[PDB]
Amino acid sequence: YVVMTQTPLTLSVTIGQPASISCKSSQSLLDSDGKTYLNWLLQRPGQSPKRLIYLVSKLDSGVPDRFTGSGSGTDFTLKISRIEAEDLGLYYCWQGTHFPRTFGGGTKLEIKRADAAPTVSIFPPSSEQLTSGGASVVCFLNNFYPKDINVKWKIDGSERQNGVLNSWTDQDSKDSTYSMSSTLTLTKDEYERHNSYTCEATHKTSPIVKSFNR
Amino acid sequence: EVKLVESGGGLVKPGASLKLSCAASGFTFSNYGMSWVRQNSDKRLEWVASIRSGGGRTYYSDNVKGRFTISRENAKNTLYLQMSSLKSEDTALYYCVRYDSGSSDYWGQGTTVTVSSAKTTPPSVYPLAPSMVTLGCLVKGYFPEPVTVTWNSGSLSSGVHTFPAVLQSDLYTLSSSVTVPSSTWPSETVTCNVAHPASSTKVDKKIVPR
Amino acid sequence: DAEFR
Ligand SMILES: [Cl-]
Ligand SMILES: [Cl-]
Ligand SMILES: [Cl-]
Ligand SMILES: [Cl-]
Ligand SMILES: [Cl-]
Ligand SMILES: [Cl-]
Ligand SMILES: [Cl-]
Ligand SMILES: [Cl-]
Ligand SMILES: [Cl-]
Ligand SMILES: [Cl-]
Ligand SMILES: [Cl-]
Ligand SMILES: [Zn+2]
Ligand SMILES: [Zn+2]
Ligand SMILES: [Zn+2]
Ligand SMILES: [Zn+2]
Ligand SMILES: [Zn+2]
Ligand SMILES: [Zn+2]
Ligand SMILES: [Zn+2]
Ligand SMILES: [Zn+2]
Ligand SMILES: [Zn+2]
Ligand SMILES: [Zn+2]
Ligand SMILES: [Zn+2]
Ligand SMILES: [Zn+2]
Ligand SMILES: [Zn+2]
Ligand SMILES: [Zn+2]
Ligand SMILES: [Zn+2]
Ligand SMILES: [Zn+2]
Ligand SMILES: [Zn+2]
Ligand SMILES: [Zn+2]
Ligand SMILES: [Zn+2]
Ligand SMILES: [Zn+2]
Ligand SMILES: [Zn+2]
Ligand SMILES: [Zn+2]
Ligand SMILES: [Zn+2]
Ligand SMILES: [Zn+2]
Ligand SMILES: [Zn+2]
Ligand SMILES: [Zn+2]
């Protein structure tokens, strides 16, 4: 079983700058036929994996020349000379020299850009959900950077931590931002006993705040 | 265009059976080896099984050997993966993958297999009304994954963000937002469309002003 | 992939 060790785990690189991914195998990938079956693959958000490189350095049809694979034996590199936004996503090496085929653990490439604050929208429970006894208050944080943002919920001025569910998109190749949704789920019983509901967003800096009164 | 289209995924109990299929087009199917590769929640890729072009030789990882059977019907351009004695660890996205250049080249879109004792349940879909205006859809209490969300049956896509589902108590919740110019809403209507193949159910909710 | 070779 050939172990494919891929590094770094995540890479954050500015458009126009080089990126470099390493892949090391626990045995040589030189087959007795003289060829080296080391491949690289890219999975973009919302897409199926696509091969970029095969036989160490051969580019798949339509892969731009800024991608170059190199290496031999047990040490291999993928270099991107001049990063574009379309390059973001999950990169995997994998070997076809020994049985069984094995994959590296992947490297997530993120495009690094300037910090951007989210556009925040808050939504009270729908009347339909309320009828069934539930009361989710939804906050959308759209188009921010970096990904690591904090959401704080308040009810009548007091932080509420339980019953909050958060979910982030992958990076948008359009503008290199992220979006995320935060949902505070109460019962209707509790929801109807309180007046003000607030979500606050920040990375660290006074937060962006959206509030409504029931 | 090489196209690989998987189906047959969904919810199956531990110990039970499920057969996946993959329809190939855009190439001479019988000339190519084929393989199944799965991807887990941590985005780890794991080879499952392979079959040579003439279907004479089959290969399995130690994880599934004795449990899964890969096969193909060349006259139907179809690859199959018969899974049996399923384990919760088998839960994953399964890809149909073509073998070429000495390597795998084309990957399908993948089909989701969930091994669980929980029941199938369709989503509840709740419309979320408010220069640009942001509108929303809350998709709550369904199982298993996936659902697909579109807006105006796919005619609106530029301003759309759909958030990955989060699991709580073998129930999933997801949401989606769409942003349109505020001068066009509500005059030009906006509807979220949610499809849940596992319960064979779709729901459309118009976003109406409060 | 090695298995196909
Ligand atoms: Cl990604
Ligand atoms: Cl910021
Ligand atoms: Cl408050
Ligand atoms: Cl409360
Ligand atoms: Cl209360
Ligand atoms: Cl911020
Ligand atoms: Cl085997
Ligand atoms: Cl529609
Ligand atoms: Cl459906
Ligand atoms: Cl269906
Ligand atoms: Cl409709
Ligand atoms: Zn060999
Ligand atoms: Zn991703
Ligand atoms: Zn590409
Ligand atoms: Zn370019
Ligand atoms: Zn070997
Ligand atoms: Zn910063
Ligand atoms: Zn965005
Ligand atoms: Zn308050
Ligand atoms: Zn976006
Ligand atoms: Zn933007
Ligand atoms: Zn209370
Ligand atoms: Zn605060
Ligand atoms: Zn910030
Ligand atoms: Zn209001
Ligand atoms: Zn990751
Ligand atoms: Zn696994
Ligand atoms: Zn074997
Ligand atoms: Zn194995
Ligand atoms: Zn073995
Ligand atoms: Zn499916
Ligand atoms: Zn409903
Ligand atoms: Zn419609
Ligand atoms: Zn479960
Ligand atoms: Zn359907
Ligand atoms: Zn419909
Ligand atoms: Zn062959």
Number of domains in chain A: 2
C-beta atoms surrounding B160 within 10 Å: 16
Q: Which residues are found with C-beta within 5 Å of the ion, ligand 37?
A: B 33; C 4
Question: Can you give the three-state secondary structure of chain B, one letter per residue?
Answer: CCEEEEECCEEECCCCCEEEEEEEECCCHHHCEEEEEEECCCCCEEEEEEECCCCCCEEECCCCCCCEEEEEEHHHCEEEEEECCCCHHHCEEEEEEEECCCCEEEECCCEEEEECCCCCECCEEEEECCCEEEEEEEEEEEECCCCEEEEHHHCECCCEEEEEEEECCCCEEEEEEEEEEHHHCCCCCCEEEEEEHHHCEEEEEECCCC
Both A8 and A105 in a single domain? yes
- Cross-strand pairs, B156: B151
Q: What is the chain B residue with the closest CA to C4?
A: B52
Question: Which segments of chain A does DSSP mark as H helices, in order?
Answer: 127-131, 188-191
Residue B82: is it exposed, middle or buried by C-beta count within 10 angstroms (0-12/13-18/19+)? middle
DSSP state of A207: P
Taking CA–CA distances from A33, the nearest residue in chain C reads: C5
Distance B190 CA to ligand 33 centre (A): 9
Residues forming beta bridges with residue B39, ordered by sequence position? B45, B93
Please indicate, yes or no, whether residues A127 and A178 belong to a single structural domain of this protein.
yes
Instruction: Return d(Cα A66, Cα A87) in angstroms, integer.
Output: 11
Instruction: Tell me how close the Cα of C5 comes to any Cα of chain B, in angstroms.
Output: 8
The secondary structure element, H or E, covering residue A122 is strand A119-123
3-state secondary structure of A191: helix
User: How many CB pairs (< 8 A) connect B and C?
Assistant: 12
Indicate whether A33 and A99 sit together in one domain. yes
3-class SS at A128? helix
Both tokens of residue A163?
């019953």
d(Cα A94, Cα B46) in Å, to the nearest integer?
Answer: 10
Instruction: Specify the DSSP class assigned to residue A127.
Output: H
As a whole number of angstroms, the distance between CA A101 and CA B97 comes to 13
Rounded CA separation A173/A88 (Å):
7
Q: In what order do the strands lie in the sheet with A158-160?
A: A158-160, A150-155, A196-202, A208-213
Residues of B190-204 as b/e, b for ≥16 C-beta within 10 angstroms? bbbbbbbbbbebebe
Q: Among B166, B36, B52, which Cα is nearest to B110's?
A: B36
Nearest Cα residue in chain C from A99: C2
The alpha carbon of residue B125 is apart from the nearest alpha carbon of chain A, in Å, by: 9
In three-state secondary structure terms, A9 is: coil
Residues A109 and A3 in one domain: yes
Contacting residues of C for A100, CB less than 8 Å apart: 2-3
Per-position b or e across A147-170, b if 16+ CB within 10 A of its CB: eebebbbbbeeeebeebbbebebb
Q: Tell me, yes or no, whether A7 and A100 share the same domain.
A: yes
Distance between CA atoms of A179 and A175, rounded to whole angstroms?
Answer: 11
Name the token pair of B135: 């509108």
**Domain end call among A113, A137, A154:** A113
For A19-74, give the DSSP string: EEEEEEESS--B-TTS-B-EEEEEE-TTS--EEEEETTTEEPTT--TTEEEEEETT
Whether B166 and A90 lie within 8 Å, measured CB to CB:
no
The structural domains of chain B, with segments of one domain joined by +, span: 1-117, 118-209
Chain B residues with at least one Cβ partner in C under 8 Å: 33, 50, 52, 57, 59, 99, 102-104
User: What is the domain range of residue A133?
Assistant: 114-214
CA C2 remoteness from chain centre: 3
User: CATH assignment of B1-117, given 2.30.110.10, 2.10.260.10, 1.10.3720.10, 2.60.40.10?
Assistant: 2.60.40.10
The angle subtended at Cα A110 by Cα B6 and Cα B44, nearest 5°, is 40
CATH number, position A4: 2.60.40.10
Cβ-Cβ pairs closer than 8 A, A with B, add up to 114
Same domain, A1 and A84: yes
Alpha-carbon span A119 to B19, nearest angstrom? 45
Residues A120 and A105 reside in one and the same domain: no
Q: Name the 3-class secondary structure at A169.
A: coil
Resolution for this experimental structure (Å):
2.2
N-term to C-term CA, chain C: 7
For residue B104, the chain C residues in CB contact (below 8 A) are 1
Beta-bridge partner residues of A211: A198
Q: What is the CA radius of gyration of chain A?
A: 23
This structure was determined by X-ray
CA–CA gap between residue B149 and residue B147 (Å, rounded) = 7
Q: Which residues pair with A50 in a beta bridge?
A: A42
CA distance A101 to chain C (A): 6
Kindly list the distances between the CA atom of residue B172 and the CA atoms of A7, B100, B123, B126, in Å, as whole numbers in the listed order: 33, 38, 8, 14
Subunits next to A (3 or more Cβ pairs <8 Å) are B, C
Contact: A169, B162; criterion CB under 8 Å: yes
Residues A211, A170 share a domain = yes
Given A66, A83, A113, the domain boundary residue is: A113
Neighbours of B31 (CB within 10 A): 9
Q: Indicate the CATH number of B118-209 among 3.30.70.3000, 3.40.50.970, 3.40.50.720, 2.60.40.10.
A: 2.60.40.10
Mapping DSSP to helix (H, G, I), strand (E, B) and coil, where does residue A165 land?
Answer: strand
Q: Are the folds of B1-117 and B118-209 the same?
A: yes
The residue among A91, A113, A135 that closes a domain is A113
**Could you give the 3-state DSSP secondary structure of residue A131?**
helix
Same-domain check for residues A103 and A18: yes
Is A198 buried (19+), middle (13-18) or exposed (0-12) by CB count in 10 A? buried
In terms of phi and psi (left: phi > 0; alpha: psi -120 to 50; beta: otherwise), the region of A78 is beta
Instruction: Residue B99: list chain C partners with CB under 8 A.
Output: 1, 4
Chain centroid offset of residue A116 CA: 17
- Are A56 and A133 part of one and the same domain? no
Tokens of residue A139, six digits? 């906050």
Integer Cα distance of A8 and A26 in angstroms = 17
Q: Tokens 């193909």: give the residue.
A: B72
> Which of B34, B37, B50 would you mutate first to test chain C, the one with the most C CBs within 10 A?
B50
Contact (Cβ atoms closer than 8 angstroms) between residue A123 and residue A25: no
Tokens at A161, concatenated:
């931590």
CB-based burial label for A87 (10 Å; 0-12, 13-18, 19+): buried
Contact between B128 and A138 using a beta-carbon 8 Å cutoff: yes
Q: Examine the domain organization and report whether A74 and A99 are in the same domain.
A: yes
Q: Residues A75, A127: one domain?
A: no
d(Cα A160, Cα A191) in Å, to the nearest integer?
12
Tell if the CB–CB gap between B104 and C1 is shorter than 8 Å: yes
Give C1 to chain B, closest Cα distance, Å: 6
Paired residues of B195 in beta bridges: B148, B202
Q: How far is CA A146 from CA A112, A116, A119, A150, in A?
A: 8, 7, 14, 11
CB B133 within 8 A of CB B181: yes
Query: Which stretch of DSSP H or E encloses residue A139?
Result: strand A134-144
Closest chain C residue by Cα to residue B59: C3
Query: How far away, in angstroms, is B62 Cα from ligand 29 center?
Result: 5
Are B78 and B72 within 8 A, CB to CB?
yes
Q: What is the DSSP letter of A84?
A: -
What is the distance between the alpha carbons of residues B116 and B144, in angstroms, rounded to a whole number? 9
User: Residue A24 contacts by C-beta under 8 Å, 6 or more apart in sequence?
Assistant: A4, A5, A6, A7, A74, A75, A76
